[PDB]
């Protein structure tokens, strides 16, 4: 049994970040990874998605060339040109991450880890056993797919993983789901030319976001050509002579349900959820607590119910973002190896950007969450809706919506929600202000930068 | 003599903002304007400039279409298509501003105001006299041009005002000056296809900005095809059979001066400075203090040396920006009509964006200003330089540079300077944080938004 100071299971966002910071502090660390370093984000997540979003953005702005005095570009987009440069970029990142571990003297153990029945927590990878007084589980998650028993033919559809393997742009695509991944995929496929439908169980997408955002985002999707199929779900899928045929039931409240067949579908993409990667760890051997979905239960310090075993990232099922796994991973390294016992991540005020068209930026409480926490009488919101100056001269239009949620007499800014051009790069700084406890007066006393869309947030009345 | 509670001279950024806020507080106000409402910003400043910058941005990104899998767009940009839509937009804004004054019951007196010899401050506009216990001078400024005596033929060149009258893209252009207006004009003309030279007296542009920015900005200009002529100045200009011929002297320190003739110049644009609009006000009649350049001297509350007379905006010659004139104008209205005697603008930490390619964002102290204010031992800077993810797949590259200037033990963030894609919309929030007194730890404890360029500012080490 080879011993280390820190054993990290999973070489993704949280695992690499934690192992590297631990090493800086003097810990002899090893990272176990069965697949590719960089994990979900680098390989089939944030990075390849952003490159594809940058591609879709070019496609949208191209609609505006003639309005700006430029000649029209004839036609056909070539998916494989960008797909290949994208894959190459991911290969470059994998090599960089490997180099980063080696330069920090972190040992990389390749293979699938699983806990053993040994008394003191011990894992086995390819027949060999490894142990450490501190073991971090950062195995992340994976796309969820319907069971063939509940939806016959579900296995004919792909997940976001499959999206990154596509070598040609699908002609007709149906995305099922209403969360940010679904919205992003629908927006990229549609911008690039696929006849796209987004199937949702209710009437709006991103239902956990402030209502101004779910409402505005659903409308922008429709305005951009995405067919949003409301109150609908797949009953079954079948392979026809030319594509898939999707049977769906649409049950709009107050109407009779209606069954419809969507024919000649080239791509059915399930974007219904993520499931934690814990089934093959043999957690049961140590009695590590999980919820019924398989997520590992942890306290505020990322401790599991078993001493010397921690968990961070997607596997814990809360705030499924790369920077969250990274921040939690680092805070944990400081707690264990620098002895800062108060080192832990504050899960409040975590900012998020959804790469839709236009992008969405959000941090803090939605209006309803603030109303429930402070009381209707103590919540005041300020909002604005305008057409960015960029569209002053175009036939195509997008809107920019912003909402500021304030609480109490002092009007502490507890939430900022917005959608519009530039919102993706605009959020970080306001997130710093919100984390500091800014009030509306702090925003109001900051001189505006003109002409920008960002200045609207410091001049709300 | 018609009397009012508040008489504003100049219907531009600061004048309109001050008159409107005063009216909201109950003051019977009148605005004097001899030209077009909206002033410099709306008519020949911020607005038409931003539309032209948005146009140049399309031109630059077009270089990247083929890398992203799109077909190449053939050729010719048509200047007059956008020029006309731009003019129309400015007309729409002028009508909006007029409507805003009328709806607030602010009287608009058209014509040129000049003070009289009357004891109590009184102005005359087209033979009629007007007075008020509070008179605001917000006459702004105008482009500066060389005297024919110092530079024969200087009158053959145009200023930024003339830039907005151009109906065709000049084939060859020479911009003289090294401030932000010069840099912006050079960048738009070059992006749109003009063979452009930028003539500067030294070796770098924007010499008052942090050195990381002046250095990086000069290089980006050169990389983008702008010919930067260092240590050079115009000796004379003459009209030839086909364009202008510019004689310039280049005196690089440590070399002999050399005289050069730049022939076939279509457009010579002077971007050497701004001069305050005070010569025709008859300020001398009331003994209102001005400096030798004609700027009106004011204290921290915008008071002149004469009671009941104030000045805000460009005419005061400090922080020549639209939002500054607006903020000062409003703070003054609250002081006079709401009796908030502490109401005044803090001229520190005013943020600025230069619409270059890529754009520049800056707020606070440069490294040298911080070194002089706190002492070398008490200043720590953090910087980074990277190529944005957007260029991971392109042959063309731009850089993103960021610098954070911290002071004292706590590392109070006293300055943020950056240049790169997205920096124009990224600055506002960090400006709010800096105004609040954020330290490096506040930035460091804010969870990053991935993948963006903005996340680099919260992960500097
Ligand atoms: C389509 C998509 C787009 C996304 N876009 C964004 C975005 O733009 N911004 C953002 O912040 N977040 C985004 N996310 C979320 C982000 O990818 C995750 O939050 C993040 O990857 C979670 O990191 P992690 O360390 O928890 O796990 P992961 O990154 O998934 O890493 C877990 C690693 O552990 C390895 N592993 C698993 N089991 C074992 C085992 N038993 N033995 C050995 N190795 C094992 C896996 O191979 C994997 O490499 C996106 C996700 C998806 C799916
Ligand atoms: C090319 C250019 C680009 C710029 N871009 C930006 C930018 O992107 N962002 C930014 O913040 N700033 C920008 N600025 C600066 C900004 O335009 C000024 O800071 C702002 O206009 C100053 O406002 P003001 O109220 O002081 O004066 P002005 O806006 O100039 O208004 C003064 C008004 O008073 C009127 N007037 C003058 N004398 C009299 C008189 N005696 N009687 C009656 N009426 C009179 C004038 O006609 C004018 O309308 C730019 C300026 C220029 C030149
Ligand atoms: O297709 C084009 O010519 C414009 C591309 C483009 C763009 C254009 C104007 C503008 O004001 C902003 C802007 O932002 C982006 C951002 C991207 O990631 C890609 C293209 C752009």
Swiss-Prot record, chains A, B:
Record Gene3D superfamilies: 3.30.390.30, FAD/NAD(P)-binding domain
Record: residues binding glutathione: 13, 20, 97, 330
Domain of life: Eukaryota
Alphabetized UniProt keyword annotations: Acetylation, Cytoplasm, Disease variant, Disulfide bond, FAD, Flavoprotein, Hereditary hemolytic anemia, Mitochondrion, NADP, Oxidoreductase, Redox-active center, Transit peptide
Cofactor: FAD
Effect of residue 313 to A: In CNSHA10; decreased glutathione reductase activity; decreased enzyme stability
Catalytic activity: 2 glutathione + NADP(+) = glutathione disulfide + NADPH + H(+)
Chain sites annotated for binding NADP(+): 178, 181, 184, 201, 207, 273, 320, 353
Free-text comment on the cofactor: Binds 1 FAD per subunit.
Keyword Secreted: no
Function as written in the Swiss-Prot or TrEMBL entry: Catalyzes the reduction of glutathione disulfide (GSSG) to reduced glutathione (GSH). Constitutes the major mechanism to maintain a high GSH:GSSG ratio in the cytosol.
Domain notes: Each subunit can be divided into 4 domains that are consecutive along the polypeptide chain. Domains 1 and 2 bind FAD and NADPH, respectively. Domain 4 forms the interface.
Protein name stated in the entry: Glutathione reductase, mitochondrial
